[PDB]
Amino acid sequence: MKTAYDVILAPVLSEKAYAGFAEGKYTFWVHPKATKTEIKNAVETAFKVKVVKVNTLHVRGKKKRLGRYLGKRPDRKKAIVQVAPGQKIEALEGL
Amino acid sequence: MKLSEVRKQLEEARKLSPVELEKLVREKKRELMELRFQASIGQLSQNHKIRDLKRQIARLLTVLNEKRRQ
Amino acid sequence: MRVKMHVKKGDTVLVASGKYKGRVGKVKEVLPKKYAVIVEGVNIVKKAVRVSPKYPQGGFIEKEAPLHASKVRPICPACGKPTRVRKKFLENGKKIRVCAKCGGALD
Amino acid sequence: SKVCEISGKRPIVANSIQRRGKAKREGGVGKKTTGISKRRQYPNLQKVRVRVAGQEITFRVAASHIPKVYELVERAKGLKLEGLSPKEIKKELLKLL
RNA sequence: AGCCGGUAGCGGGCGUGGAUCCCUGGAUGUCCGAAUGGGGGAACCCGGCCGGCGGGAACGCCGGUCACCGCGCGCGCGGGGGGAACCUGGGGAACUGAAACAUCUCAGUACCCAGAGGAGAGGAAAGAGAAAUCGACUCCCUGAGUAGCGGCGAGCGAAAGGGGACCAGCCUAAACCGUCCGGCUUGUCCGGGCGGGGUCGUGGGGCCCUCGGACCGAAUCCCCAGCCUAGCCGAAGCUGUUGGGAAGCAGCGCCAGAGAGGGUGAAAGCCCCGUAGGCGAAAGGUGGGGGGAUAGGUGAGGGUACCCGAGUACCCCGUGGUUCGUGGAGCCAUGGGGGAAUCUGGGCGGACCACCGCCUAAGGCUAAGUACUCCGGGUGACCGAUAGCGCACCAGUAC
RNA sequence: GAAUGCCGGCAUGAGUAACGAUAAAGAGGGUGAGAAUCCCUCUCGCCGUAAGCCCAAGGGUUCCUACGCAAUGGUCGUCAGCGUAGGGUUAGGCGGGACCUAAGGUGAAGCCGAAAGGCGUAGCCGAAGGGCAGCCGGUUAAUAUUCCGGCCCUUCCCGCAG
RNA sequence: CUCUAAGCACAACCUGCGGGAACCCGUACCGCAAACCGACACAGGUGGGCGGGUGCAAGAGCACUCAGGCGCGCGGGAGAA
Ligand SMILES: [Mg+2]
Ligand SMILES: [Mg+2]
Ligand SMILES: [Mg+2]
Ligand SMILES: [Mg+2]
Ligand SMILES: [Mg+2]
Ligand SMILES: [Mg+2]
Ligand SMILES: [Mg+2]
Ligand SMILES: [Mg+2]
Ligand SMILES: [Mg+2]
Ligand SMILES: [Mg+2]
Ligand SMILES: [Mg+2]
Ligand SMILES: [Mg+2]
Ligand SMILES: [Mg+2]
Ligand SMILES: [Mg+2]
Ligand SMILES: [Mg+2]
Ligand SMILES: [Mg+2]
Ligand SMILES: [Mg+2]
Ligand SMILES: [Mg+2]
Ligand SMILES: [Mg+2]
Ligand SMILES: [Mg+2]
Ligand SMILES: [Mg+2]
Ligand SMILES: [Mg+2]
Ligand SMILES: [Mg+2]
Ligand SMILES: [Mg+2]
Ligand SMILES: [Mg+2]
Ligand SMILES: [Mg+2]
Ligand SMILES: [Mg+2]
Ligand SMILES: [Mg+2]
Ligand SMILES: [Mg+2]
Ligand SMILES: [Mg+2]
Ligand SMILES: [Mg+2]
Ligand SMILES: [Mg+2]
Ligand SMILES: [Mg+2]
Ligand SMILES: [Mg+2]
Ligand SMILES: [Mg+2]
Ligand SMILES: [Mg+2]
Ligand SMILES: [Mg+2]
Ligand SMILES: [Mg+2]
Ligand SMILES: [Mg+2]
Ligand SMILES: [Mg+2]
Ligand SMILES: [Mg+2]
Ligand SMILES: [Mg+2]
Ligand SMILES: [Mg+2]
Ligand SMILES: [Mg+2]
Ligand SMILES: [Mg+2]
Ligand SMILES: [Mg+2]
Ligand SMILES: [Mg+2]
Ligand SMILES: [Mg+2]
Ligand SMILES: [Mg+2]
Ligand SMILES: [Mg+2]
Ligand SMILES: [Mg+2]
Ligand SMILES: [Mg+2]
Ligand SMILES: [Mg+2]
Ligand SMILES: [Mg+2]
Ligand SMILES: [Mg+2]
Ligand SMILES: [Mg+2]
Ligand SMILES: [Mg+2]
Ligand SMILES: [Mg+2]
Ligand SMILES: [Mg+2]
Ligand SMILES: [Mg+2]
Ligand SMILES: [Mg+2]
Ligand SMILES: [Mg+2]
Ligand SMILES: [Mg+2]
Ligand SMILES: [Mg+2]
Ligand SMILES: [Mg+2]
Ligand SMILES: [Mg+2]
Ligand SMILES: [Mg+2]
Ligand SMILES: [Mg+2]
Ligand SMILES: [Mg+2]
Ligand SMILES: [Mg+2]
Ligand SMILES: [Mg+2]
Ligand SMILES: [Mg+2]
Ligand SMILES: [Mg+2]
Ligand SMILES: [Mg+2]
Ligand SMILES: [Mg+2]
Ligand SMILES: [Mg+2]
Ligand SMILES: [Mg+2]
Ligand SMILES: [Mg+2]
Ligand SMILES: [Mg+2]
Ligand SMILES: [Mg+2]
Ligand SMILES: [Mg+2]
Ligand SMILES: [Mg+2]
Ligand SMILES: [Mg+2]
Ligand SMILES: [Mg+2]
Ligand SMILES: [Mg+2]
Ligand SMILES: [Mg+2]
Ligand SMILES: [Mg+2]
Ligand SMILES: [Mg+2]
Ligand SMILES: [Mg+2]
Ligand SMILES: [Mg+2]
Ligand SMILES: [Mg+2]
Ligand SMILES: [Mg+2]
Ligand SMILES: [Mg+2]
Ligand SMILES: [Mg+2]
Ligand SMILES: [Mg+2]
Ligand SMILES: [Mg+2]
Ligand SMILES: [Mg+2]
Ligand SMILES: [Mg+2]
Ligand SMILES: [Mg+2]
Ligand SMILES: [Mg+2]
Ligand SMILES: [Mg+2]
Ligand SMILES: [Mg+2]
Ligand SMILES: [Mg+2]
Ligand SMILES: [Mg+2]
Ligand SMILES: [Mg+2]
Ligand SMILES: [Mg+2]
Ligand SMILES: [Mg+2]
Ligand SMILES: [Mg+2]
Ligand SMILES: [Mg+2]
Ligand SMILES: [Mg+2]
Ligand SMILES: [Mg+2]
Ligand SMILES: [Mg+2]
Ligand SMILES: [Mg+2]
Ligand SMILES: [Mg+2]
Ligand SMILES: [Mg+2]
Ligand SMILES: [Mg+2]
Ligand SMILES: [Mg+2]
Ligand SMILES: [Mg+2]
Ligand SMILES: [Mg+2]
Ligand SMILES: [Mg+2]
Ligand SMILES: [Mg+2]
Ligand SMILES: [Mg+2]
Ligand SMILES: [Mg+2]
Ligand SMILES: [Mg+2]
Ligand SMILES: [Mg+2]
Ligand SMILES: [Mg+2]
Ligand SMILES: [Mg+2]
Ligand SMILES: [Mg+2]
Ligand SMILES: [Mg+2]
Ligand SMILES: [Mg+2]
Ligand SMILES: [Mg+2]
Ligand SMILES: [Mg+2]
Ligand SMILES: [Mg+2]
Ligand SMILES: [Mg+2]
Ligand SMILES: [Mg+2]
Ligand SMILES: [Mg+2]
Ligand SMILES: [Mg+2]
Ligand SMILES: [Mg+2]
Ligand SMILES: [Mg+2]
Ligand SMILES: [Mg+2]
Ligand SMILES: [Mg+2]
Ligand SMILES: [Mg+2]
Ligand SMILES: [Mg+2]
Ligand SMILES: [Mg+2]
Ligand SMILES: [Mg+2]
Ligand SMILES: [Mg+2]
Ligand SMILES: [Mg+2]
Ligand SMILES: [Mg+2]
Ligand SMILES: [Mg+2]
Ligand SMILES: [Mg+2]
Ligand SMILES: [Mg+2]
Ligand SMILES: [Mg+2]
Ligand SMILES: [Mg+2]
Ligand SMILES: [Mg+2]
Ligand SMILES: [Mg+2]
Ligand SMILES: [Mg+2]
Ligand SMILES: [Mg+2]
Ligand SMILES: [Mg+2]
Ligand SMILES: [Mg+2]
Ligand SMILES: [Mg+2]
Ligand SMILES: [Mg+2]
Ligand SMILES: [Mg+2]
Ligand SMILES: [Mg+2]
Ligand SMILES: [Mg+2]
Ligand SMILES: [Mg+2]
Ligand SMILES: [Mg+2]
Ligand SMILES: [Mg+2]
Ligand SMILES: [Mg+2]
Ligand SMILES: [Mg+2]
Ligand SMILES: [Mg+2]
Ligand SMILES: [Mg+2]
Ligand SMILES: [Mg+2]
Ligand SMILES: [Mg+2]
Ligand SMILES: [Mg+2]
Ligand SMILES: [Mg+2]
Ligand SMILES: [Mg+2]
Ligand SMILES: [Mg+2]
Ligand SMILES: [Mg+2]
Ligand SMILES: [Mg+2]
Ligand SMILES: [Mg+2]
Ligand SMILES: [Mg+2]
Ligand SMILES: [Mg+2]
Ligand SMILES: [Mg+2]
Ligand SMILES: [Mg+2]
Ligand SMILES: [Mg+2]
Ligand SMILES: [Mg+2]
Ligand SMILES: [Mg+2]
Ligand SMILES: [Mg+2]
Ligand SMILES: [Mg+2]
Ligand SMILES: [Mg+2]
Ligand SMILES: [Mg+2]
Ligand SMILES: [Mg+2]
Ligand SMILES: [Mg+2]
Ligand SMILES: [Mg+2]
Ligand SMILES: [Mg+2]
Ligand SMILES: [Mg+2]
Ligand SMILES: [Mg+2]
Ligand SMILES: [Mg+2]
Ligand SMILES: [Mg+2]
Ligand SMILES: [Mg+2]
Ligand SMILES: [Mg+2]
Ligand SMILES: [Mg+2]
Ligand SMILES: [Mg+2]
Ligand SMILES: [Mg+2]
Ligand SMILES: [Mg+2]
Ligand SMILES: [Mg+2]
Ligand SMILES: [Mg+2]
Ligand SMILES: [Mg+2]
Ligand SMILES: [Mg+2]
Ligand SMILES: [Mg+2]
Ligand SMILES: [Mg+2]
Ligand SMILES: [Mg+2]
Ligand SMILES: [Mg+2]
Ligand SMILES: [Mg+2]
Ligand SMILES: [Mg+2]
Ligand SMILES: [Mg+2]
Ligand SMILES: [Mg+2]
Ligand SMILES: [Mg+2]
Ligand SMILES: [Mg+2]
Ligand SMILES: [Mg+2]
Ligand SMILES: [Mg+2]
Ligand SMILES: [Mg+2]
Ligand SMILES: [Mg+2]
Ligand SMILES: [Mg+2]
Ligand SMILES: [Mg+2]
Ligand SMILES: [Mg+2]
Ligand SMILES: [Mg+2]
Ligand SMILES: [Mg+2]
Ligand SMILES: [Mg+2]
Ligand SMILES: [Mg+2]
Ligand SMILES: [Mg+2]
Ligand SMILES: [Mg+2]
Ligand SMILES: [Mg+2]
Ligand SMILES: [Mg+2]
Ligand SMILES: [Mg+2]
Ligand SMILES: [Mg+2]
Ligand SMILES: [Mg+2]
Ligand SMILES: [Mg+2]
Ligand SMILES: [Mg+2]
Ligand SMILES: [Mg+2]
Ligand SMILES: [Zn+2]
User: Fold this and answer.
1) In whole angstroms, what is the distance from residue A64 CA to residue C10 CA?
2) Domain boundaries, position A57
3) Looking at the DSSP assignment, which residues form a beta bridge with residue D57?
4) Which segments cross the bilayer (chain D)?
5) Out of A3, A6, A10, closest to residue B37 by CB
């Protein structure tokens, strides 16, 4: 049906992402084809905040193997959204 | 979920208009994202709930697609 | 389309052949992908266990090993005898397993 | 040269047979074949310019079927032709076969 | 009655309120690909238009629509690409053989290309060819390695007839009517549509005179059986013994329209899966068979000589096809030139002529018998891991 | 039993040649089951229009960190571009696209060719050429003209004013 | 930038200011090399920029050095042909 909950997939659980909460920058795993305008509206519908800046980057999957079988982990995309001054995303300040 | 709850879910969904159906899916999709968060911090013991909600969303969209196609 | 299984959890069966021939016991479990069954108290093998949770002593446990389904025969609850399985269509139309010896139902 | 638009005459493959000797019917020992190789025989294609309904139509035709083009000009006087394009015109004249 | 694929486990669930699973129909189906809004280094990028979403105008997202080409009066319909072999058409080698080599052979094969379909081609005599005969076409056997062809070398190689498989015949053009539209050489005009008429070789049809006034029936459509895409019922054995294990050995029985085969701890008709013999479809596919509709189909003399497929027949030049390599070279086909007639016309019977016979050219369609094996099943004096497919296995992979 | 036959297995040569630039090493301390070979310190030597630094191709996780040492590494190995796992690439201004054209490619029109196809004006595509707005510093184990800080700037939309 | 055509001059453009809006892909690391081309951690091959100092006539030459980076992934002895 296409909802904000299709764009945002999971939070990014890393010491690097956590260190950004203090400045209001929250890092999410998002859908690989989602644009910056889309992620903006998806966060603002999902978490009741105002997004003033969105950075994005693609994260290629790591090649892995299991014995004889060489494979690859799926590709992913991270978005870092800056919320308006004084706002916060409680579902992430967790953590 | 349980087979009787699926049956009841399908009776009730079929009494809903397309607007109600969209609003329900939007709600269950939100709860699904909440389940993925919980599961990603190791907090979803009952991981069967993830699949159940996903099929629920499938049934609802199936019935929504039904009601715009009689 | 399915593995045909003449025996069910957990009816009563005779183990008609093998080391435990003559034993009568309850079908604990049925394994269609293996055409096997597990019969309570039959086929007891010694499995070795590492020290751990569940076995902080280590040592060994007892396990029922599976039996090939053809070594097993239901004991009919009407006449109490080991028997082959016949099919019978009930008045409503459902089919049930009946006893080739007398005719009683086996469920 | 290609294809007669009217008859569909097209190039055909023919052999070129080189011969020596005196034909038996002239008292010779007979003709011997000193070379056979493939060649093509083309239709005698020419351009016919005709003017139909104040438009100029150009046909690529075998010389054999040149009169068949003017035949189509006559049979087109009963067709409602004005206002049409030279392409659409030729189609009408050609559909009259 | 178990289940959440291979796949165990962690951690959690479902199922006699019928799950898993199997069949059928439907729904969803990102992006690329004929790929088709446009572009592009396939799976990426960038737009128009209408509607929606956000604070939304810029920005973005969602839904819809937008290529080219053909055919019919901007609207429809169709086309495109794929498919293991098979098929038809358009093109078309060489090694090799001729113990050299060029005609010839290999061979209209290999291959390229276009197209077709579950087949394709062919097909209702301008046939055969010598029987006062046969009677569409395709396919098998035979005719026959015959007749012939052939640097008469190497080689190449028919047809009629006979025995069989299958079986089926149709629509049209023209004459002559009618109508509509067009033209401006004004009409008994010419042309274009459409409709009626008509379809044959003993010739047939048109038009005008007399007379005579229902059977047949599709290859099209409907219904149905049958079949396919899951399935299901299915006889009869116990004990002792050796042994890890019985199905072996021993005792005593039993079934059989079932003693094919495979499994089970070793060697089992009666333990299991099966086998003989039976049973089964709401849904989709098929339906060449049974039934029913529709289209369609049909006389005699008599007179008239209107019509019977044109750059065609026919002749000549250059070639192909056929057994025919220029041969006495006809026949079928046709690139060039010349160029008719409508039955008192025309083609053929191997130059040609006479006679005597056969057949009706220049429009189209047509099941079945035939071919193939990607697919499914059945069966082997077929293989059994260097074998059998290149692959029994994560192979068109690694490399 | 032979085909310099085929596939495979294992021998011989042989503990032999070699271990890949003659820029070069020594010691102390540490770690560890194990140390010439890993880490730290001091001494020594070599490059220094490079053997240093930054771009572009190409490569494609080789980056950082933890845990490893069967194999890979021409020795060794506690080390590693190796194995296992987690983390890591942040842009209106850098580069490319939503801009332009070049050769060339493609190609409505048009031309040609048995088929397949060959051409072809405009147009379209096509760059490392034209055009176009960001500098300095700080910060991470790992990114930074991208995040942060300071000071600047560009385009689009809408409004007001002239 | 300038010129005008259709059109339009309730528009439209230019200048100034203000608010708002600003998408897609690359960005790690190697990169004269042990990560690229050479079957190898192979003395070979690989385009552009920076490339300090002293002396030697000059210089990107040459020698030694800065910054920075290395001693080239077998060693220990012996001191025959
Ligand atoms: Mg969807
Ligand atoms: Mg964050
Ligand atoms: Mg993005
Ligand atoms: Mg959005
Ligand atoms: Mg980015
Ligand atoms: Mg990006
Ligand atoms: Mg990823
Ligand atoms: Mg991943
Ligand atoms: Mg995942
Ligand atoms: Mg993601
Ligand atoms: Mg999910
Ligand atoms: Mg995940
Ligand atoms: Mg779902
Ligand atoms: Mg059964
Ligand atoms: Mg007993
Ligand atoms: Mg048991
Ligand atoms: Mg039975
Ligand atoms: Mg039932
Ligand atoms: Mg039941
Ligand atoms: Mg009971
Ligand atoms: Mg000649
Ligand atoms: Mg003579
Ligand atoms: Mg000759
Ligand atoms: Mg000759
Ligand atoms: Mg030849
Ligand atoms: Mg030639
Ligand atoms: Mg011409
Ligand atoms: Mg002329
Ligand atoms: Mg003229
Ligand atoms: Mg002529
Ligand atoms: Mg004609
Ligand atoms: Mg659990
Ligand atoms: Mg568990
Ligand atoms: Mg019940
Ligand atoms: Mg049911
Ligand atoms: Mg779509
Ligand atoms: Mg496209
Ligand atoms: Mg394109
Ligand atoms: Mg819109
Ligand atoms: Mg908002
Ligand atoms: Mg909007
Ligand atoms: Mg958009
Ligand atoms: Mg669109
Ligand atoms: Mg094609
Ligand atoms: Mg096709
Ligand atoms: Mg063929
Ligand atoms: Mg052919
Ligand atoms: Mg051919
Ligand atoms: Mg050639
Ligand atoms: Mg030859
Ligand atoms: Mg030769
Ligand atoms: Mg030969
Ligand atoms: Mg020869
Ligand atoms: Mg020879
Ligand atoms: Mg020779
Ligand atoms: Mg030859
Ligand atoms: Mg020849
Ligand atoms: Mg041959
Ligand atoms: Mg030949
Ligand atoms: Mg072939
Ligand atoms: Mg057939
Ligand atoms: Mg056919
Ligand atoms: Mg006929
Ligand atoms: Mg015949
Ligand atoms: Mg007769
Ligand atoms: Mg006849
Ligand atoms: Mg007949
Ligand atoms: Mg004979
Ligand atoms: Mg011959
Ligand atoms: Mg020959
Ligand atoms: Mg011949
Ligand atoms: Mg031949
Ligand atoms: Mg023949
Ligand atoms: Mg004959
Ligand atoms: Mg016959
Ligand atoms: Mg008329
Ligand atoms: Mg008519
Ligand atoms: Mg008619
Ligand atoms: Mg008729
Ligand atoms: Mg008729
Ligand atoms: Mg008719
Ligand atoms: Mg007839
Ligand atoms: Mg006659
Ligand atoms: Mg007559
Ligand atoms: Mg029929
Ligand atoms: Mg018919
Ligand atoms: Mg049965
Ligand atoms: Mg039985
Ligand atoms: Mg015993
Ligand atoms: Mg026994
Ligand atoms: Mg016995
Ligand atoms: Mg039998
Ligand atoms: Mg058998
Ligand atoms: Mg057997
Ligand atoms: Mg026996
Ligand atoms: Mg046996
Ligand atoms: Mg035997
Ligand atoms: Mg048996
Ligand atoms: Mg048997
Ligand atoms: Mg049967
Ligand atoms: Mg049966
Ligand atoms: Mg049946
Ligand atoms: Mg019938
Ligand atoms: Mg009849
Ligand atoms: Mg009649
Ligand atoms: Mg008659
Ligand atoms: Mg006449
Ligand atoms: Mg005729
Ligand atoms: Mg005709
Ligand atoms: Mg002629
Ligand atoms: Mg003749
Ligand atoms: Mg001549
Ligand atoms: Mg001729
Ligand atoms: Mg021939
Ligand atoms: Mg000839
Ligand atoms: Mg010839
Ligand atoms: Mg001849
Ligand atoms: Mg002729
Ligand atoms: Mg001629
Ligand atoms: Mg005659
Ligand atoms: Mg005549
Ligand atoms: Mg003739
Ligand atoms: Mg003649
Ligand atoms: Mg004849
Ligand atoms: Mg004769
Ligand atoms: Mg004849
Ligand atoms: Mg005829
Ligand atoms: Mg046909
Ligand atoms: Mg046929
Ligand atoms: Mg098969
Ligand atoms: Mg098979
Ligand atoms: Mg064998
Ligand atoms: Mg093997
Ligand atoms: Mg093999
Ligand atoms: Mg073996
Ligand atoms: Mg073998
Ligand atoms: Mg295979
Ligand atoms: Mg195969
Ligand atoms: Mg092989
Ligand atoms: Mg493999
Ligand atoms: Mg020998
Ligand atoms: Mg050798
Ligand atoms: Mg050999
Ligand atoms: Mg040998
Ligand atoms: Mg060998
Ligand atoms: Mg070898
Ligand atoms: Mg081996
Ligand atoms: Mg070997
Ligand atoms: Mg060997
Ligand atoms: Mg070896
Ligand atoms: Mg030896
Ligand atoms: Mg050796
Ligand atoms: Mg040795
Ligand atoms: Mg030695
Ligand atoms: Mg030696
Ligand atoms: Mg030596
Ligand atoms: Mg050596
Ligand atoms: Mg060496
Ligand atoms: Mg040495
Ligand atoms: Mg050196
Ligand atoms: Mg060295
Ligand atoms: Mg030296
Ligand atoms: Mg040096
Ligand atoms: Mg040292
Ligand atoms: Mg040292
Ligand atoms: Mg000390
Ligand atoms: Mg060491
Ligand atoms: Mg060591
Ligand atoms: Mg040391
Ligand atoms: Mg060293
Ligand atoms: Mg160190
Ligand atoms: Mg010191
Ligand atoms: Mg210097
Ligand atoms: Mg590489
Ligand atoms: Mg790796
Ligand atoms: Mg190692
Ligand atoms: Mg080691
Ligand atoms: Mg080791
Ligand atoms: Mg290890
Ligand atoms: Mg190694
Ligand atoms: Mg080593
Ligand atoms: Mg090495
Ligand atoms: Mg260690
Ligand atoms: Mg490293
Ligand atoms: Mg590593
Ligand atoms: Mg990193
Ligand atoms: Mg920025
Ligand atoms: Mg845009
Ligand atoms: Mg562009
Ligand atoms: Mg351009
Ligand atoms: Mg064109
Ligand atoms: Mg050509
Ligand atoms: Mg072109
Ligand atoms: Mg051009
Ligand atoms: Mg452009
Ligand atoms: Mg281009
Ligand atoms: Mg461009
Ligand atoms: Mg550029
Ligand atoms: Mg320039
Ligand atoms: Mg530039
Ligand atoms: Mg720029
Ligand atoms: Mg600046
Ligand atoms: Mg800076
Ligand atoms: Mg950190
Ligand atoms: Mg770095
Ligand atoms: Mg900044
Ligand atoms: Mg104003
Ligand atoms: Mg004006
Ligand atoms: Mg105004
Ligand atoms: Mg501004
Ligand atoms: Mg965009
Ligand atoms: Mg790159
Ligand atoms: Mg970067
Ligand atoms: Mg960098
Ligand atoms: Mg570097
Ligand atoms: Mg170099
Ligand atoms: Mg360089
Ligand atoms: Mg370097
Ligand atoms: Mg390196
Ligand atoms: Mg490498
Ligand atoms: Mg090479
Ligand atoms: Mg290399
Ligand atoms: Mg090295
Ligand atoms: Mg090197
Ligand atoms: Mg160089
Ligand atoms: Mg320079
Ligand atoms: Mg300095
Ligand atoms: Mg300098
Ligand atoms: Mg100094
Ligand atoms: Mg001095
Ligand atoms: Mg100086
Ligand atoms: Mg000097
Ligand atoms: Mg200097
Ligand atoms: Mg120097
Ligand atoms: Mg230094
Ligand atoms: Mg050092
Ligand atoms: Mg060294
Ligand atoms: Mg070096
Ligand atoms: Mg070395
Ligand atoms: Mg010595
Ligand atoms: Zn009983």
Assistant:
1) 45
2) 1-95
3) D50
4) none
5) A10
In order of B12, B16, B49, the CA distances from B9 in angstroms are: 5, 11, 15
Q: CATH no. for residue A31? A: 3.30.70.330
Chain A residue with the nearest C-alpha to that of B62: A1
In terms of phi and psi (left: phi > 0; alpha: psi -120 to 50; beta: otherwise), the region of A83 is beta
Specify the pairing of strand C60-64 against strand C67-68: unpaired
Cβ–Cβ < 8 Å for D39, D12? no
To test the contact with chain B by mutation, choose from A1, A31, A95 the residue with the greatest count of B C-beta atoms within 10 A, namely A1
**C-alpha angle B51/B53/B57, rounded to 5°?**
115
**Phi and psi, residue B11, nearest 5°:** -65, -45
Nucleotides of G under 7 A from a protein CB: 21-27
Smallest CA–C1' separation from A32, nucleotide: E30
Query: What is d(CA B10, CA B4) in angstroms, rounded to the nearest whole number?
Result: 10
As given in the structure block, the two tokens for residue B52 are 């159940």
Q: Total structural domains in chain A?
A: 1
- The gap between D62 CA and E112 C1' (Å) is 29
Resolution in angstroms for this experimental structure?
2.3
Tell me phi and psi for residue B25, to 5 degrees.
Answer: -60, -45
**Cβ distance A42 to A34 under 8 Å?**
yes
Contact A26, A83 (CB under 8 A): yes
CB neighbour list of residue B69: distance below 8 Å, 6 or more residues apart = none
Method used to solve the structure? X-ray
Which residue is associated with the tokens 């011969």? D19
Give me C11's structure tokens: 């009816």
Q: Which two tokens stand for residue A40?
A: 């903006």
User: How many CA atoms are closer than 13 Å to the CA of B59, on its beta-carbon side?
Assistant: 20
Other CB atoms within a 10 A radius of the CB of residue B63 amount to 19
